[PDB]
Design a protein around this ligand. Structure first.
Ligand SMILES: CCCCCC(=O)CC(=O)N[C@H]1CCOC1=O
Ligand SMILES: CCCCCC(=O)CC(=O)N[C@H]1CCOC1=O
Lengths: 238, 243
């Protein structure tokens, strides 16, 4: 009877044409599980020093504004894979021992209990789904059925959002030609422009143009950043 | 039965996290494969590096005649079972249509006694792609509705490969890069395209030492450039989590 839930959810997400349908479905499923608020967050693998983070939530506008103002993304333990197990995490008082200011601000805004699930996407982006409620001592649930239900919800929603090329999950656009990616693969092996020229039987002049043309559309200083970003997102071995 | 599945997981999770040798993992897969009415299992892993001809390691109890034949005819290069594009929810059932591109492979598999099979796959924290395939000789049918099998296989792919990662098994492990936290920090900056001179200013150290760590970093990995080291680290996710 649970397996039929999995199958319907699988049928639902595969037939979605809109992002609003994805976020709405998450809203419903969260509510079926006695949770009021959902939040879907994605941390991209690049840039390496300040990884891009996009999110979408039905949290109260006041809490979102407060959260961003205090820069809580940078210290939220819910977004730290270390604190997870089997990609699952139940919110508790101890988890926020390092970030109490977050916890108190969240409680002051009406977030008593919550839970988070996470996975890694094909572009190596880290997706986080969080559910939260304002009510204590209600709890629905088996955890096992909870872990497994949420496990599916992160996957199929974010994968759906990728089919639709949504801005929240799609990495900074890097539409390269098959020629450009060949040069990237060899650059990533530590080949010089001269060696890549001989290997591909083209002039070093043509190699450097391609090299510069990729740096153009990404706005990057050298061939080193372009290659590492490509390696980091899996554009090379997808 | 829904309930006795969750407990199956909890034990299997307990099993795999506390296995101490690689043979124990392959052993567990073998029984479950048999418990699931399959004679032959195959666990295959595609590494993310090298970028130009990535290494592929495997372990199976296939008839060796087919193994020798499979490699000899070089079927990996055209095997749809190892192509993530053909999957859905990380799962894939074998049928005559999927092998529309590989006529030599399917009938040859039929000829060696692989009538029916199924494959599950997922991506590991080191960005390696793991594939688990089951196969049987009995020809007949589609088993049990396709939900518990997918889910059983979903777990079996994960925990076996994760167990093998904990054990530093060669089938899953990427080239090890035990760097100092400082050495990894300059790589993050190298991957952002900072010159040794630029990295010096931001970290308050002499340029003599920046060039020093990089060459010292190139030592332990066997590679020429500041570029290849950064790309291998970037490719494996060494540069920002999970390991
Ligand atoms: C305000 C939305 C940005 C945060 C996105 C996210 O997923 C992280 C998260 O929910 N954290 C929870 C934990 C306490 O505060 C929250 O809202
Ligand atoms: C030598 C074996 C390498 C690994 C084989 C593999 O990709 C997994 C697998 O079961 N493939 C199936 C597909 C058809 O023939 C097979 O053997």
């Amino acid at each position: 009877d649970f397996f039929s839930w999995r199958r319907t959810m699988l049928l639902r997400f595969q037939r979605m044409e809109t992002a609003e349908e994805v976020y709405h479905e998450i809203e419903l499923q969260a509510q079926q599980l006695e949770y009021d608020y959902y939040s879907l967050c994605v941390r991209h693998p690049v840039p390496f020093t300040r990884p891009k983070v996009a999110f979408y939530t039905n949290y109260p506008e006041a809490w979102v504004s407060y959260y961003q103002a205090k820069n809580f993304l940078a210290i939220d333990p819910v977004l730290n894979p270390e604190n997870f197990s089997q990609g699952h995490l139940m919110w508790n008082d101890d988890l926020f021992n390092e970030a109490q200011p977050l916890w108190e601000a969240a409680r002051a805004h009406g977030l008593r209990r919550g839970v988070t699930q996470y996975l890694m996407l094909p572009n190596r982006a880290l997706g986080f789904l969080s559910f939260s409620r304002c009510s204590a001592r209600e709890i629905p649930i088996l955890s096992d059925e909870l872990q497994l239900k949420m496990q599916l919800l992160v996957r199929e929603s974010l994968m759906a959002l990728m089919r639709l090329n949504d801005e929240i999950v799609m990495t900074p656009e890097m539409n390269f030609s098959k020629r450009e990616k060949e040069i990237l693969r060899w650059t990533a092996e530590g080949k010089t422009s001269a060696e890549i020229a001989m290997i591909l039987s083209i002039s070093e002049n043509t190699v450097n143009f391609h090299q510069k043309n990729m740096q153009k559309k990404i706005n990057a200083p050298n061939k080193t950043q372009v290659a590492c970003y490509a390696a980091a997102t899996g554009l090379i071995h997808h």
